[PDB]
Protein backbone atom coordinates (compact mmCIF):
# COMPACT_ATOMS: atom_id res chain seq x y z
CA UNK A 1 0.00 0.00 0.00
CA UNK A 2 0.93 3.64 -0.52
CA UNK A 3 1.03 6.80 1.59
CA UNK A 4 -1.50 9.63 1.77
CA UNK A 5 -0.90 13.18 3.07
CA UNK A 6 -1.30 13.69 6.82
CA UNK A 7 -4.34 15.75 7.76
CA UNK A 8 -4.40 15.62 11.55
CA UNK A 9 -2.26 18.63 12.44
CA UNK A 10 -2.58 19.36 16.16
CA UNK A 11 -3.79 15.89 17.12
CA UNK A 12 -1.70 13.52 19.22
CA UNK A 13 -1.46 10.70 16.66
CA UNK A 14 0.16 10.08 13.26
CA UNK A 15 -1.49 7.04 11.63
CA UNK A 16 0.35 4.45 9.53
CA UNK A 17 1.16 5.35 5.92
CA UNK A 18 0.43 9.07 6.20
CA UNK A 19 2.99 11.66 5.11
CA UNK A 20 3.87 14.37 7.63
CA UNK A 21 5.28 17.41 5.80
CA UNK A 22 7.32 20.45 6.79
CA UNK A 23 5.39 22.82 9.04
CA UNK A 24 3.06 20.04 10.17
CA UNK A 25 2.99 18.97 13.82
CA UNK A 26 1.46 16.84 16.56
CA UNK A 27 0.31 18.09 19.97
CA UNK A 28 0.06 15.98 23.10
CA UNK A 29 -3.52 15.88 24.35
CA UNK A 30 -2.57 18.35 27.10
CA UNK A 31 -1.04 20.74 24.54
CA UNK A 32 2.28 20.94 26.40
CA UNK A 33 4.39 19.04 23.86
CA UNK A 34 4.63 19.55 20.11
CA UNK A 35 6.26 17.24 17.59
CA UNK A 36 7.28 19.39 14.65
CA UNK A 37 8.96 18.79 11.31
CA UNK A 38 10.90 22.00 10.67
CA UNK A 39 11.52 23.39 7.19
CA UNK A 40 15.25 22.86 7.68
CA UNK A 41 14.78 19.09 7.83
CA UNK A 42 14.97 18.74 11.61
CA UNK A 43 12.26 16.70 13.33
CA UNK A 44 11.82 18.25 16.76
CA UNK A 45 9.94 18.00 20.05
CA UNK A 46 9.07 21.23 21.86
CA UNK A 47 8.16 21.59 25.53
CA UNK A 48 6.00 24.67 26.04
CA UNK A 49 7.61 26.17 22.94
CA UNK A 50 11.21 25.16 23.62
CA UNK A 51 13.08 22.43 21.73
CA UNK A 52 14.04 19.60 24.09
CA UNK A 53 14.70 16.86 21.53
CA UNK A 54 16.01 16.49 17.99
CA UNK A 55 15.89 13.36 15.85
CA UNK A 56 19.50 12.37 15.15
CA UNK A 57 22.22 9.71 15.35
CA UNK A 58 22.52 10.14 19.12
CA UNK A 59 19.00 8.82 19.72
CA UNK A 60 19.19 5.31 21.23
CA UNK A 61 17.62 2.50 19.18
CA UNK A 62 17.51 4.48 15.96
CA UNK A 63 19.50 4.17 12.73
CA UNK A 64 20.69 6.62 10.11
CA UNK A 65 21.41 5.44 6.56
CA UNK A 66 22.19 7.35 3.35
CA UNK A 67 19.40 8.78 1.22
CA UNK A 68 20.65 8.57 -2.37
CA UNK A 69 17.45 9.77 -4.04
CA UNK A 70 17.71 13.56 -4.38
CA UNK A 71 14.06 13.55 -5.47
CA UNK A 72 12.71 12.39 -2.10
CA UNK A 73 10.64 15.21 -0.53
CA UNK A 74 11.23 16.15 3.10
CA UNK A 75 8.81 13.80 4.83
CA UNK A 76 8.14 11.88 8.03
CA UNK A 77 5.96 8.78 8.13
CA UNK A 78 5.25 5.46 9.84
CA UNK A 79 5.41 2.02 8.20
CA UNK A 80 5.75 -0.13 11.28
CA UNK A 81 8.96 1.79 11.97
CA UNK A 82 9.20 5.58 11.71
CA UNK A 83 11.19 7.19 8.89
CA UNK A 84 12.51 10.69 8.30
CA UNK A 85 13.55 11.38 4.70
CA UNK A 86 15.91 14.35 4.81
CA UNK A 87 17.74 14.76 1.49
CA UNK A 88 19.27 18.05 2.65
CA UNK A 89 21.56 15.81 4.68
CA UNK A 90 21.46 12.75 2.42
CA UNK A 91 19.96 10.82 5.33
CA UNK A 92 17.11 8.59 6.37
CA UNK A 93 16.64 8.52 10.13
CA UNK A 94 14.59 5.54 11.27
CA UNK A 95 13.52 3.76 14.44
CA UNK A 96 14.79 0.34 15.47
CA UNK A 97 11.48 -1.20 16.61
CA UNK A 98 11.23 -4.36 18.68
CA UNK A 99 10.92 -7.60 16.72
CA UNK A 100 7.79 -7.61 14.55
CA UNK A 101 5.28 -10.43 15.03
CA UNK A 102 3.15 -10.16 11.89
CA UNK A 103 2.69 -8.21 8.66
CA UNK A 104 -0.61 -6.92 10.04
CA UNK A 105 1.36 -4.66 12.39
CA UNK A 106 2.27 -2.45 9.44
CA UNK A 107 -1.39 -1.45 9.10
CA UNK A 108 -2.19 -0.78 12.76
CA UNK A 109 1.02 0.76 14.11
CA UNK A 110 0.84 4.51 14.61
CA UNK A 111 2.88 7.20 16.35
CA UNK A 112 1.58 8.97 19.45
CA UNK A 113 2.87 12.02 21.28
CA UNK A 114 2.06 11.32 24.94
CA UNK A 115 1.28 13.86 27.67
CA UNK A 116 4.69 13.01 29.17
CA UNK A 117 6.52 14.18 26.06
CA UNK A 118 7.50 10.69 24.91
CA UNK A 119 6.82 9.64 21.33
CA UNK A 120 5.70 6.04 21.13
CA UNK A 121 5.07 3.66 18.26
CA UNK A 122 1.96 1.73 19.21
CA UNK A 123 0.58 -1.40 17.59
CA UNK A 124 -3.08 -0.46 18.09
CA UNK A 125 -6.26 -2.47 17.50
CA UNK A 126 -9.71 -1.06 18.26
CA UNK A 127 -11.68 -4.18 19.15
CA UNK A 128 -14.81 -2.12 19.82
CA UNK A 129 -15.62 1.54 19.21
CA UNK A 130 -18.89 2.71 20.72
CA UNK A 131 -18.46 6.23 19.38
CA UNK A 132 -17.04 6.00 15.84
CA UNK A 133 -17.74 9.68 15.16
CA UNK A 134 -15.55 10.76 18.08
CA UNK A 135 -11.79 10.70 17.47
CA UNK A 136 -9.63 8.23 19.39
CA UNK A 137 -7.09 10.25 21.36
CA UNK A 138 -4.22 8.16 22.84
CA UNK A 139 -1.63 9.38 25.35
CA UNK A 140 -3.88 11.54 27.53
CA UNK A 141 -3.39 11.56 31.29
CA UNK A 142 -7.06 12.66 31.18
CA UNK A 143 -8.49 9.39 29.94
CA UNK A 144 -10.09 6.80 32.17
CA UNK A 145 -8.72 3.27 31.74
CA UNK A 146 -10.34 0.17 33.20
CA UNK A 147 -8.31 -3.04 33.32
CA UNK A 148 -10.00 -6.39 32.60
CA UNK A 149 -11.82 -7.65 35.70
CA UNK A 150 -13.30 -4.30 36.70
CA UNK A 151 -16.83 -4.08 38.10
CA UNK A 152 -18.78 -0.97 37.17
CA UNK A 153 -20.63 -0.61 40.45
CA UNK A 154 -24.14 0.76 39.95
CA UNK A 155 -24.51 4.47 40.63
CA UNK A 156 -20.79 5.25 40.67
CA UNK A 157 -19.72 8.03 38.32
CA UNK A 158 -16.43 7.19 36.60
CA UNK A 159 -14.91 10.38 35.23
CA UNK A 160 -12.54 11.40 32.46
CA UNK A 161 -12.26 15.16 32.56
CA UNK A 162 -15.82 16.41 32.04
CA UNK A 163 -16.96 13.11 30.53
CA UNK A 164 -18.34 10.17 32.50
CA UNK A 165 -19.29 6.49 32.36
CA UNK A 166 -22.19 5.33 34.55
CA UNK A 167 -24.04 2.09 35.22
CA UNK A 168 -27.19 3.97 36.22
CA UNK A 169 -30.07 3.34 38.62
CA UNK A 170 -32.36 2.67 35.64
CA UNK A 171 -29.98 -0.07 34.54
CA UNK A 172 -28.62 1.75 31.50
CA UNK A 173 -24.88 1.82 30.89
CA UNK A 174 -24.15 5.29 29.54
CA UNK A 175 -21.16 7.38 28.51
CA UNK A 176 -21.69 11.13 28.69
CA UNK A 177 -19.69 13.68 26.70
CA UNK A 178 -18.24 17.00 27.92
CA UNK A 179 -21.43 18.87 27.01
CA UNK A 180 -23.44 16.58 29.27
CA UNK A 181 -25.15 14.70 26.43
CA UNK A 182 -24.89 10.93 26.06
CA UNK A 183 -22.37 9.83 23.43
CA UNK A 184 -23.23 6.14 23.79
CA UNK A 185 -25.46 3.80 25.77
CA UNK A 186 -26.05 0.05 25.96
CA UNK A 187 -29.81 0.61 25.83
CA UNK A 188 -30.43 -1.61 28.84
CA UNK A 189 -32.68 0.72 30.83
CA UNK A 190 -35.73 -1.02 32.31
CA UNK A 191 -34.62 -4.51 31.29
CA UNK A 192 -33.71 -5.63 34.80
CA UNK A 193 -29.94 -5.08 34.69
CA UNK A 194 -28.16 -6.12 37.90
CA UNK A 195 -24.46 -6.17 37.05
CA UNK A 196 -22.11 -4.41 34.62
CA UNK A 197 -18.55 -5.63 34.24
CA UNK A 198 -15.53 -5.28 31.98
CA UNK A 199 -14.61 -8.95 32.31
CA UNK A 200 -11.20 -10.59 32.60
CA UNK A 201 -11.61 -11.98 29.07
CA UNK A 202 -11.85 -8.43 27.74
CA UNK A 203 -15.61 -8.50 27.20
CA UNK A 204 -17.83 -5.66 28.44
CA UNK A 205 -21.09 -7.19 29.67
CA UNK A 206 -24.36 -5.99 31.18
CA UNK A 207 -26.13 -8.81 33.03
CA UNK A 208 -29.78 -9.14 33.99
CA UNK A 209 -31.44 -11.52 36.44
CA UNK A 210 -30.14 -15.08 36.28
CA UNK A 211 -26.95 -13.92 34.59
CA UNK A 212 -28.98 -13.28 31.45
CA UNK A 213 -26.91 -11.34 28.93
CA UNK A 214 -28.57 -8.00 28.18
CA UNK A 215 -25.74 -6.50 26.15
CA UNK A 216 -22.07 -7.09 25.43
CA UNK A 217 -19.28 -5.66 23.31
CA UNK A 218 -18.49 -8.95 21.54
CA UNK A 219 -14.83 -8.51 22.47
CA UNK A 220 -14.42 -11.67 24.53
CA UNK A 221 -11.10 -13.49 24.29
CA UNK A 222 -8.76 -10.51 24.68
CA UNK A 223 -7.31 -10.49 28.20
CA UNK A 224 -4.85 -7.75 27.23
CA UNK A 225 -7.48 -5.23 26.12
CA UNK A 226 -8.41 -2.08 28.05
CA UNK A 227 -11.61 -0.07 28.26
CA UNK A 228 -10.97 3.61 27.67
CA UNK A 229 -13.22 6.59 28.25
CA UNK A 230 -11.78 9.79 26.83
CA UNK A 231 -12.33 13.34 28.03
CA UNK A 232 -13.98 14.02 24.66
CA UNK A 233 -16.69 11.43 25.28
CA UNK A 234 -15.16 8.59 23.27
CA UNK A 235 -15.56 5.08 24.63
CA UNK A 236 -13.71 2.09 23.18
CA UNK A 237 -12.02 -1.21 23.95
CA UNK A 238 -8.50 -1.47 22.57
CA UNK A 239 -5.75 -4.06 22.33
CA UNK A 240 -2.44 -2.17 22.28
CA UNK A 241 1.31 -2.63 22.74
CA UNK A 242 4.25 -0.24 22.19
CA UNK A 243 7.06 -1.20 19.82
CA UNK A 244 9.29 1.88 20.21
CA UNK A 245 9.77 5.13 22.16
CA UNK A 246 12.34 7.94 22.45
CA UNK A 247 12.94 7.25 26.13
CA UNK A 248 12.23 4.48 28.62
CA UNK A 249 11.91 1.98 25.78
CA UNK A 250 14.28 -0.95 25.46
CA UNK A 251 13.79 -3.81 22.96
CA UNK A 252 13.99 -6.46 25.68
CA UNK A 253 12.12 -4.59 28.44
CA UNK A 254 8.57 -5.55 29.37
CA UNK A 255 6.02 -2.88 28.45
CA UNK A 256 3.48 -1.66 31.00
CA UNK A 257 1.20 1.33 31.64
CA UNK A 258 2.00 3.93 34.30
CA UNK A 259 -0.25 3.78 37.36
CA UNK A 260 -1.92 6.44 39.50
CA UNK A 261 -1.07 6.46 43.21
CA UNK A 262 -4.52 4.90 43.45
CA UNK A 263 -3.28 1.80 41.59
CA UNK A 264 -5.30 2.75 38.49
CA UNK A 265 -3.70 2.56 35.01
CA UNK A 266 -3.22 5.63 32.82
CA UNK A 267 -2.85 5.93 29.06
CA UNK A 268 0.92 6.43 29.29
CA UNK A 269 3.44 3.73 28.37
CA UNK A 270 6.56 2.94 30.35
CA UNK A 271 9.04 0.04 30.44
CA UNK A 272 10.12 -2.82 32.72
Ligand SMILES: CO[C@H]1O[C@H](CO)[C@@H](O)[C@H](O)[C@@H]1O
Pocket residue numbers: 168170172174182184185189
Ligand atom coordinates in the same frame (compact mmCIF):
# COMPACT_ATOMS: atom_id res chain seq x y z
C1 LIG B 1 -34.30 7.43 27.00
O1 LIG B 1 -33.25 7.78 27.91
C2 LIG B 1 -32.31 6.78 28.37
O2 LIG B 1 -31.06 6.73 27.63
C3 LIG B 1 -30.30 7.94 27.73
C4 LIG B 1 -29.15 8.05 26.69
O3 LIG B 1 -29.42 7.54 25.40
C5 LIG B 1 -29.87 8.20 29.16
O4 LIG B 1 -29.06 9.35 29.32
C6 LIG B 1 -31.06 8.14 30.14
O5 LIG B 1 -30.70 8.36 31.48
C7 LIG B 1 -31.93 6.85 29.90
O6 LIG B 1 -31.34 5.66 30.40
